[PDB]
Amino acid sequence: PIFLNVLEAIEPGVVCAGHDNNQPDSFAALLSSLNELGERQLVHVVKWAKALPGFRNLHVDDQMAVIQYSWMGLMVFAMGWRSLTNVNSRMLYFAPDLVFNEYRMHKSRMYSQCVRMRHLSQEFGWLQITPQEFLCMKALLLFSIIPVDGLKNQKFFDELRMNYIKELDRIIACSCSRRFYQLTKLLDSVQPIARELHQFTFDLLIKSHMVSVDFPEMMAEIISVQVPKILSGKVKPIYFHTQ
């Protein structure tokens, strides 16, 4: 079981947001801390992705591209999983030091997006997703969003993506196809969520000075350079099933 050995070994550790929980729960304070969390998580997602089986067979530019497109989905998926194990069905465990109750979901002005992330977290429970299924699905998510113009070497990407589909299939097989149906629908459901957060974070960056929300350097860059390519349709998710 080489492949699963690898996925479990490279899985990133606990990451703290650096949030001072002693301050009043403001919009400005919550969102600056999520942005800080995003910056620190992006560091772990990079090292993780670079260590995945076959990842270096991608052209260097494509390596950087898929990470920059996929990070939001990847982080949301992992977060829902932490949430499942750590908190109740009504809260979102962004970090040990940044757990959203209903009040914070409201003050963040992200209530409706939070409701979707919670549903995602509950689906992991409802479907009884295993650690092994979780890890293979999360690897797949990295290879689930690409430019419509195609990548620098698209051929290598398509082959890598095929291998990770086959790995998820293997993990399932151990009816059988009903599980595969379920997992692919779950995977698809990530993308509309990421899309709403993309739109939210983009809007927030533009108004960020007016509302006193701080955006760290990598975040500022990625949200101004890469996110708008998603929002304008130059970069699109790959769905398993038609939307």
Ligand SMILES: C[C@]12CCC(=O)C[C@@H]1CC[C@@H]1[C@@H]2CC[C@]2(C)[C@@H](O)CC[C@@H]12
């Ligand atoms: C990826 C993060 C931070 C990491 C995580 O656990 C998921 C979470 C989802 C909401 C994101 C947040 C990073 C900062 C964003 C993009 C804010 O600007 C608005 C929505 C936030």
